[model samples]
Target: SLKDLDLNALFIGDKAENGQLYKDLLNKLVDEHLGWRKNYIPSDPNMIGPEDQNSPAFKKTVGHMKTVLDQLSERIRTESVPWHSAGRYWGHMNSETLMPALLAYNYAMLWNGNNVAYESSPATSQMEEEVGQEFARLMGYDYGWGHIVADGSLANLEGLWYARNIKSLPFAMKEVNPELVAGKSDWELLNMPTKEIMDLLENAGSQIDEVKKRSARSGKNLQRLGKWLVPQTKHYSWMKAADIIGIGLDQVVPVPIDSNYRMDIQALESIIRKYAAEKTPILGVVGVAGSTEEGAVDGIDKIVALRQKLQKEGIYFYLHVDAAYGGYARALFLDEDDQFIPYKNLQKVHAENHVFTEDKEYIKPEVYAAYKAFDQAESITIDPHKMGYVPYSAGGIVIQDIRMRDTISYFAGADIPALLGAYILEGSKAGATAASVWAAHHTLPLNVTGYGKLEGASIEGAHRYYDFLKNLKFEVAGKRISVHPLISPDFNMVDYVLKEDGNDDLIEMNRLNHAFYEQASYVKGSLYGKEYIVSHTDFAIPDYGDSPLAFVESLGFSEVEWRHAGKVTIIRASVMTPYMNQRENFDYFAPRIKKAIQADLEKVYA
Candidate 1:
């Protein structure tokens, strides 16, 4: 079915093959906007006469505006990263903006609607609500709710806010009505699941206000809520969220990751048991569906199982999966109704659709297990900007229970419909963003035929790239060179380092890789000169502990070298371009990439 779909028409294209369509879409937007303005009160007298338009001051002002716009256009053309056109751009988690998203964004901006209040942007606000429900369903939530946020950072903060409030509600209930919390100790109350706490709150009726006052939310110490567990590979936003949400940074614990960069389940169980023995309440456990740096997927299914096992032992914690990078990839395993297709059925679907050329296992068992457990999470963070192929400032947070929204909403009054402001972190956000996402969802179903097709292509491309690096060997810079990937990609990103055979010096390997980076990346004067672009990341002992040591040894380094140099920098390439799925496209770029690396190695030798 990929052949049945015209992929070229879905995007603006590397060569602007759909340039006329884009221009026409823009023209239609302007025409609709103008028509709306002209049709309003047509019989009413015009505010400005024809002579006013011809006035010298008005003409001069318009001319100055044009001049300023011209400058902006030239600057944007020259300085902006060619994310849309350059398949070589494997640096960041960005790619071509979907055509429907681009058009819908510009169209909605013409009206300048504010999504914070329904009264301010009735149409787009409703659109946002629909988008939220659709996303919730796509995430496999039977009756949950969600909403758009600025990005994953804010979404993470909101999830934290939810966890903190939900964790403290039982204590608040104790203070409100002792009979309701009758036989339970503080420890028992703390370990109760989220549903039990919500049920109590629902029954509290008018006394909910008193419960709110006694909870941690009302200036009480956050230590009462207990420790927050996050993977070491968590986004920086989690640390920021801990600080912003009144949970001290010190209370946030980093769980170690395995060799493949996934969170270690055994280590997590030990930590949880340690905390349980000490009666330290665990506020929450954050899992990552796709880590930003290595594209690693934590074992969510195992975490869910652990929580169930621990709940029997009177130990419990909230679960939030940060799927900002790989959330949309779930589409590859979903049907039209958001049902998880069994692995066997999924293979059949892929084969029927011809999603990949060669018969290969794209989704690893661990990765598939993780995605299947997403619905078990209490909350999840998904970034539309990253994998939705939408523009900037689009992220989402979904809660497994629809009632959870009431736990965080700031109520001004009882009868207000313009209440999105009360429910989210950002008060005033552009309705255009909501419209853009809505349009994308409208044009492209979030199931196997739509986002699945696109994201599946990315995964296939990542596999090809990984294989290419694995087999590549060249003698360059006066030594035998062979590149090593961190792991077979868990998603669409590949991170690796170049090593000179017989040289196991960690620092030396890092130096060679850094040199390669400068020549292939966006250095001060090398932006246009570079044939291939990539990004880099460093895994350090200080932040990661001994989690990366296994990987370090696999790179042919010993513990002594690792101890001498606490970190290793590796190049990161996210295969986000759909064009790479085509063999001819990969053929054109692969050799060029080889040539570019060779040229960079020459400079390193010089």
Candidate 2:
């Protein structure tokens, strides 16, 4: 049993004179350096329950999880592979692998109470409010106001509610009072002249021609469709928002992305120019802070510049940042130095990887430029559970101007009390989610060096993955195997491909990678148990064609051919959990992958 313990063996040297010196140094280091920072105390500490005995249900759950973990560990050691798809970045903190969240869940369960509404969970309500404010602060908004939502999707829906209502105000006000619209009835209001609007729509290449043709047949002008612009790489929710808000899917325009997967600023400017020239009412622009595919960050600095240009041209569009993953990194802005300390350096100096470090240079100037740009955005979507290292069901939307919340949620009626002079999309809110978020923030405040310290751990983990992948070899039919270039990480998600010689058969290799992934599910009835876990997707470059699917078809193959070939499926890895850095944990899984590939290759040929 003692021989099975890796850490203990590493600490204890061989029985030689030099080995004795090593042991002495190790003991000194543990007591003086590592032990000091771990917050470890010998005394028994309990957040809940008596210390003497374990409950039957707790024991049963623990036993079951231990079995699962054993299986999981084995699978990871044997067959786990990287995620190759865009947007589906896999890491230790995904919904299924929720160790930190589970710990928090247990802690909360010990103090169980309903967090819905302030009266039910007053302390938690306040905690949630505090967490919301912290999120706002991290995003560089002075007047940050938000409430927790169930998840990023609901948070996105709430964002749409705000976007649609705010953008539709000019029309809604006119509806409420005909005098405001030159004394028009409901029919007249809905059937306003649209020659200019139609011209604008046609110029934008929108599908509004169908609506215009319908109007011609009916002998009545239809109301102009409201439009919003988002990057091609944006989440699908923008389209869903248009449908839900009655604007129709045709009204939503997808701007293009540059090589870096960021919004094409010039292309965006051109689209906005066409709308302005044709007298089209541009609603807003949805800028993604952390894009799903590559975890790419749109040039917020460029967006701010565009905002100014549009302002001068009398074109007003609200800017909303979808920062579901990147918001926590915003805390790096508050550090006096403003620079991120590389985790590698911290590891070398500290000898242990857990404690925060500060012996590094300040933040880069370009990052500050981006930080300033965030201040110009009207609203933002931030998921606390994502970068906050908090539990799931913790997402928030912060508006720069507090009054804007009223514009979207004005339906609550005047008689309803304003708790802090603000209205939210949801009336009954969960105080527990808020409390958990607030507690996490308080425990780990948003400071320059402090928060950056935590994020740096992820950054280091990603770099380590890059190092590991670089040395591995693959026999894919296309280009030689390669890791995605380690761009500066805004968060801990990395993308790489198993490229081979310059054969351009990326699709085939990607397909093989996906097939291998599907066949290696460790959570199920695998004989060898769990070894590794990952996720993946096919890559689609949109600017090359009308749609991603169309682009794939243009690659000299039919849709079926492309699917059969499996070209360009991306393998992704997310190093969200700090535990991943442990050599014992990481080393345990690497060799198993090679073995799995060998076995699969043999079976395929057999």
Candidate 3:
């Protein structure tokens, strides 16, 4: 590095290189405080001169802080997940931030503005609003409001909050009409057809001008609406959201999934019919594009179409697409113009995360259709931290209607724009996060050349790895790969199991798979020791796929074994390594996987 420094050219002012890089960054924080000392505004001419920040005492304190930070730094450097260092750290839904975001976040830390309202952070607030608009546009809506939050969980909560507060429409004949609410509990009326409810509200001619009218302000609370229909594959946030939204654990419904770990369309339909027949109200239905544990994408197109069909019959429920992990991946299927590519219209795949000789192939049609159907969702939670490759705690939600955002309005004054604090769920949020995201977006257009590249690469890497693992087979003197025969991928994560003929003992296989995951996992009670990290989660028999025996047979396993095991322990690899799709990477990883498999198998069989 010293040889390559080009010292004379790089150095400018004495201070240009005077301070250590870390020290310079640290001092800049104090420097901002010094400037804010008086702002020297209205000129307090007699205000004493600023303290000597460079004094021995201050430097002594800084020295102490340095040693403390070093302690942490060394341990973290040694133990933290090597996401940025080209290691196999594929266990969760987070990855390295691009250099642009890092620089922006560091640079924006000085002011420490609150992003709750424009007044608190004029520039970042507007930037956040702009980011929201960009997200809306990405979601295929020409106009919608989006705002930054701490994480996907929080964003998911907001979606539920807005839905809970605004989605229900009730009628009392004395106030509006009777038929809609007749013999129906408040819950039943709340879940009535959207068209009928809207018409009822329109014809009612009360202060309720639209669906987004603040329910709390109306002071006529409808009984809490029905359950939050979630998937077995849902992120933990949905349950947390239920708790936060007061929907209660009892009211949170879990929808089953198919063999692919996708929400069972027919199952969901059956539940809806059951609810309708019982006249149980519906609050919301969540479609997760990137499930937390499995990365399974629900049949969003099917879900939306179902809702549309229901809407015709005067049935409606708030739709929230929890695309937190996979939101940014939409860029992969989008064109240079940020438009969803009709899978049929797509040519070669330029969005490869692999070491590509530049080859494109057909994308899954369902994925393309799902991407196209995003706008139909009432709200969606996307995490920049997860896929945008930004720093921690930058989650966002986009509402198709600004009005719906007002449904949960609070603590507002006529000063209006001057009083945005009352409207948002968070009263104080880091503006620096917005700056980080804004800066990243500025440097990398969210288009094909920018996010599309990274997202495409991730997807391509997953697909390539899947193919590599699936096609791997050895015979004779070569290794006859046969452990994991069943493989399925949704997005960058792959789930597989050992179903080889030789390892047909279902119980043994479960125990073996469990050991493999633990042995490979980086997290050993949070200390991080494993080299090639991965994750494993289980799929309950009926929850995922129609039946354990049924799907096992589909996966080339014996129904007898499936009946014996009655479940599948999905070995999940949540890979976000940018170069995972490289051919060399596959070559390197394939052998490593074989070695790990052999090691685990040896321990078990012996």
Candidate 4:
């Protein structure tokens, strides 16, 4: 049954295997769009339009557009990374967009619907509403609400926005309707659960406006809201969220990561206890499902368990998971019912579905637990442009409770507001993005058989590459070279460094890796010269502190060496191409990767 579904037909291939079909579909979409234009009411039509199109000036204008189109093609061919079609590229979170999404976006952009309001894009707006619910379901929430944003940063910001307002609402309730929070101390109010807070808002009834006026978003001092605990490996968006939300950077505490590069649950509990002792109101806690640098997945299961324990101790904090890069990987753990498949049965399901290599297991026990815990989070950020393999500028934020939208929206009148503009930070969003996402989910459903197959291949590829790096030791230019993976990847990205065997100098390692990156990645004026394109990241003392010391030492570098160097640079390879799933393809690419590194090393030492 799995083999019956041709995965090759879903994407336009590396060698353009589906190129003719793609072009035919694109042409059909344009023809259909034009047909719609021609079929519009013909009364008083083409009077001035026909004269304008027949003139000499119109011919020149059309010629100019063609010239610019040619220019654009030339520039794209020479400058762009072939992320969509090249398996050799392990550069970023981007991959070949799904054909269904690409066609839908092309078709919808011709309509140019602005999804700010239902009136503006009635049909596409409704599509987005359904898409939001679909995303919520995929994340394991039976009933919740979500909407698309410009990017993951905005989604993270909007989540914080909701947290900030909801965190301050109970205090507002004390003033608006004392009976709702009657006999409750300020401590009790601060520790109140989100559901209780929403219930309090419902009780406010007509006086809801009064409570809204008293919220932190209105004029309350932000200091009333306490710290935001985030993983040290959090996306830069969290810092920007703190800045944008007017919560000082100092208030955003960085919880240290463990040896495996995941958030240290013990360290997180310690910070929460310190804040709890001080009676500080925690705005929220952010758990990263897939971290940016090394693709580390935080122990969300541990964090959720800790929250349940702390809530009993009269300490409550909202939890948000930033799963922008790894949310789609949820498909890997779910069955046909959208329920998490049992960990023991995962291998069997993947085997039956051909989701990954039949013999190689990918999901770790802790990683499995983290995915199952997603429904426990208050909100989460997922990006279609990244793992969803849709086009750019599409990120989503889903809340566990659909009612949280009422607490956050700027507008107050409706039970279900027709205006999405009031609920999100973005003013005008492309309806094309909504159509694209909807089409992609429809074409390849979010369950294990669909996105799971795509992402499982990516995970397997990363592990396969990591295994190669693990045992790879060679010499070039009279120097022994060995590769060290930063950590066993929790997802499909591998961060590693090329080291001179027994070289104690962190600077030397950094130098060699940087040189390797320069040669392997794109260079202007020599774009075609690169053999295998990859990306890189740096872990600095100021940013990550000694959190990475354990990992560094494991790679044969000491804490003293790490601190002295102040930073470690590692090449980051994001394995997103589904072509890497096949053993024959991997066999072909792995040798090229070695040869490319060999070439880079020759240049570095010479």
What's the CA RMSD for each of the models?
Answer: 2.1, 12.5, 6.5, 2.0
Model 4, backbone clash pairs (residues 3+ apart or across chains), number: 0
Cα lDDT tens digits, model 4, 1-606, are 343456788888777789999999999999999888877644644656867998999989999999999999999887765434345676765657889999999999999999988888888998898889888899888778888889999999999998998999988888777888899889888888888898889878889888888888676768888899998867888998998899878899999888778889999999999988989888899999888877888999999999899989999999999999999999898776677899999999888888886566788899999999999999999998899999887999999988788776777332334788887877888889899999988877787878888888889878878888887877898889988877788999888888898888998889888888887776654635455777888888876878778777877888789978999997888888777777787888788878887887888778
For each candidate, the alpha-carbon lDDT, in order, equals 0.85, 0.55, 0.67, 0.85
Clashing pairs in 4: none
Candidate 4 residue 223 C-alpha distance from true site, Å:
1.0
Error of 4 at 37 (Å): 2.0
Off by over 4 Å in 3: 1-60, 78-90, 169-224, 348-358, 413-417, 473-481, 523-531, 542-549, 555-566, 592-596, 603-606
Instruction: List the candidate numbers ranked by lDDT, top first.
Output: 1, 4, 3, 2
Query: Candidates' TM-scores?
Result: 0.96, 0.66, 0.82, 0.96
User: CA shift at 133, candidate 4, in angstroms?
Assistant: 0.8
lDDT of 3 by residue, 258-283 (tens): 75667888988888878867767678
How much is the lDDT of residue 467 in candidate 1?
82
**Candidate numbers, best TM-score first, in rank order:** 1, 4, 3, 2
Residue 431 of model 4, lDDT score? 87
